[PDB]
């Protein structure tokens, strides 16, 4: 009844004030969290600790795949440490972080710890593929920035880039009026 | 103006190798050594424990051999390139290019990475056509940062005016003797230059007193006196002076020939710059930065042929 | 190095932020702080310390050639380390962005407000010396054309003092003491620009609509292409003053000039200036890109009128991707399965009565959709 | 048993397993086990680490749940290599100081006959080191 009031488009606390599209976006996401069908009472208790229940999640997810890393800590990849969290919240339905609060909070717990721990998060390898997913661009704009080298380095599927390089490129060359750092702050 | 099939200059600035010494307490000197590992051999060079600091030593001559071409078969190409040096020095002057070369000596730009993690380092110059009381720069990291800090030294006039007279006179000489004093921490990373091997780290070395010692490259040293080039479009970092000026970090040419501002495209406008310099209206900043770069490539030397 | 945050403001320019730090914390001018700042990045082994400017003119991240990614990477370190409570510096910078306008105008962005690249001032920044004494810092609106008057005192912005010399805060500090005279600057009433700069600031001022800061600045580029001249503050107020029948008054006259100058008429030949110059300015939010929705509401009630005149106006596959906000691969996909009906990409086999019905069926969004101008 | 690494940084992956064996010899404080690298190639360690004399301990259960696990010679620690690296040649002077340091010198030509390294750390402190292992 908290959910059916909230999925109607109406207010129920502590569940947030969002548009009609962006309340459906939480539902397909939360089903992948349990890896089952939707659970409604654990939906309510999860957002009584928002965002520190989501802060409770990302602490679990980076500390696991560092233990269960198969390659060395310099050969780690972004899809191998955080391929589940970062690639599961990009377009819900769009990159509007003012309403997609999942990625817009995820950016906060990625930017802050970048150069903590010898720059572990800021040195994650990336393809030319997943560089286009984060920037919201195409492969041709990556291939244009390797010629003139605004973007420091072609094989698209060979891991040539670093995450703190792609993260700081978004903040100076690829924002928008919705997908920018200045709504969640 | 088409380029001949025989053109060449000599360099007007001639560095030497860099010699690494170690000053123990009791004030005595011993040349620095390094290791060699095999199991593909990698050499490691670090300061010994009881050392106090580190000297460095080389010598630069502003020979001023850029006044006329070294070899040039066509006499029209020779008579033009003589008139630019006599017009650059009359209308602009060597004061801007003498200061930028001399800052790279008078701070440790020729000490490439060994500057990093130091407490203080000092430079002492021994100029040759000179009276006495050697010019010394003290505590460069804090005292000297901006150019003005160099000009507040008690004799900064008297040493730019050597390099100008060395470039102005048809037999100008101006030998300098540079000596540095790096106050490192204990057991410090020191990086010398290193040989080219066809393909893991083998240093360029010499022999100082029957022992091996790492030496900064003679060519390695002049590549840091010539980090002057910040006249390219949307310039941020100053570059090593060269034709179609490269940047070896991000492996790209700024001043690529499609920009129109490499060296060979400015040599073909050499007659064009003679009418601008021979007016009375002072030319724009865009068109003297083309002349500062044009003189820094005759000081660099090289061969300028075609066909 | 260890510093202090001053009083933080929500309209301070970035160039004013490196003067309110450099004065307070014992540096001689702005040049001394920048030189000290570049060295600091060398000690903590930042990659683009060698690109960090010692000029306060090129401090903004669009002045970098390749190092704009390393300039905000230089900016993402100082707010975490060299202060006590972290200051807001990324919220003051003028970053580039890829948001292309109509027809091909690029854009820059300062936080959550996107500006036309063609409206940036670069010669000499006008200022108000009354804000330079009471506020004492530089409002970020001073970096742009279109903003001619100070909206907080109703007084004009100065560009040349009494001795024939100019004034700029990036070279003459934040006090207001000029160069040649070192005096207080002698000042230089209207309403037509006064209410625009109150609207350009981000407050509510009529008859200019309640658009966001990204969309209040997307119209000033659009109107200068209409008059094809320098910006008249008088007519830009009076254009919106009779919405919608002032905005329609050009529209019904746009067709009458282009009907006389009927099946080989095109949408580029009959409604080409109003439509192609209004798609993204800056984006496709029809709640706040009011130009398209009112023209669509004009052309929804004109679809099959005049025996379907507007339904018979021809479109390509290139200029259909401008409307539908898609790529050329999805256009050729709808030719194989035949949802859109008539390969040459620049072929004139597609009409406006055919495209607009497809957008109401297969190409909506949350902002580029019919659900606002109903 | 003999553990198979089936994805792979075996060198850095085999080295975490000893950290469990480093910690499990403090809860029970035994040394009754042996260490054997069968596929000791002259490049890598090989995807076979084996304990001879684990399979139910906390680290190896979650390792086994994913689709990648199956669960003479003298492998001795050689910390004489650790003093060949020249950050330790100056530690060694401050040891032997307890005098002229300038009459001590370097070696300038060394040849290390097939050592092998596995990088680890401490847990009292925040300090790293190397487990140099040869035949
Ligand atoms: Zn004011
Ligand atoms: Zn004045």
Tab-separated table of N, CA and C and ligand atoms in Angstrom, chain C residues 127-137 142 147 150-157, ligand 1:
chain	number	residue	atom	x	y	z
C	127	UNK	N	31.860	45.962	-15.875
C	127	UNK	CA	31.622	45.685	-14.471
C	127	UNK	C	30.854	46.840	-13.853
C	128	UNK	N	30.329	46.601	-12.660
C	128	UNK	CA	29.673	47.648	-11.881
C	128	UNK	C	30.506	47.945	-10.648
C	129	UNK	N	31.062	49.153	-10.508
C	129	UNK	CA	31.868	49.465	-9.317
C	129	UNK	C	31.069	49.579	-8.026
C	130	UNK	N	29.735	49.534	-8.084
C	130	UNK	CA	28.943	49.533	-6.860
C	130	UNK	C	28.840	48.127	-6.289
C	131	UNK	N	28.887	47.110	-7.155
C	131	UNK	CA	29.065	45.743	-6.677
C	131	UNK	C	30.516	45.469	-6.316
C	132	UNK	N	31.445	46.263	-6.848
C	132	UNK	CA	32.851	46.082	-6.521
C	132	UNK	C	33.240	46.800	-5.237
C	133	UNK	N	32.296	47.459	-4.569
C	133	UNK	CA	32.554	48.042	-3.263
C	133	UNK	C	31.665	47.471	-2.169
C	134	UNK	N	30.400	47.180	-2.465
C	134	UNK	CA	29.485	46.603	-1.490
C	134	UNK	C	29.520	45.084	-1.482
C	135	UNK	N	29.404	44.449	-2.647
C	135	UNK	CA	29.658	43.017	-2.718
C	135	UNK	C	31.147	42.727	-2.837
C	136	UNK	N	31.865	43.533	-3.612
C	136	UNK	CA	33.300	43.399	-3.739
C	136	UNK	C	33.779	42.227	-4.562
C	137	UNK	N	32.879	41.443	-5.143
C	137	UNK	CA	33.269	40.308	-5.964
C	137	UNK	C	32.582	40.457	-7.316
C	142	UNK	N	28.821	39.144	-15.902
C	142	UNK	CA	29.671	40.135	-16.540
C	142	UNK	C	30.506	39.554	-17.677
C	147	UNK	N	23.923	40.828	-21.521
C	147	UNK	CA	23.862	41.451	-20.204
C	147	UNK	C	24.614	42.767	-20.298
C	150	UNK	N	23.580	46.392	-15.060
C	150	UNK	CA	23.541	45.734	-13.765
C	150	UNK	C	22.115	45.724	-13.230
C	151	UNK	N	21.604	44.523	-12.975
C	151	UNK	CA	20.226	44.321	-12.553
C	151	UNK	C	20.023	44.482	-11.054
C	152	UNK	N	21.030	44.933	-10.316
C	152	UNK	CA	20.894	45.070	-8.881
C	152	UNK	C	20.928	46.511	-8.410
C	153	UNK	N	21.316	47.456	-9.264
C	153	UNK	CA	21.314	48.863	-8.910
C	153	UNK	C	20.645	49.751	-9.948
C	154	UNK	N	20.252	49.194	-11.102
C	154	UNK	CA	19.798	49.941	-12.284
C	154	UNK	C	20.800	51.012	-12.705
C	155	UNK	N	22.039	50.593	-12.948
C	155	UNK	CA	23.115	51.498	-13.348
C	155	UNK	C	23.924	50.767	-14.419
C	156	UNK	N	24.434	51.452	-15.444
C	156	UNK	CA	25.175	50.747	-16.502
C	156	UNK	C	26.555	50.264	-16.083
C	157	UNK	N	27.083	49.336	-16.879
C	157	UNK	CA	28.389	48.740	-16.639
C	157	UNK	C	29.486	49.520	-17.370
E	1	LIG	ZN1	27.099	47.101	-8.493
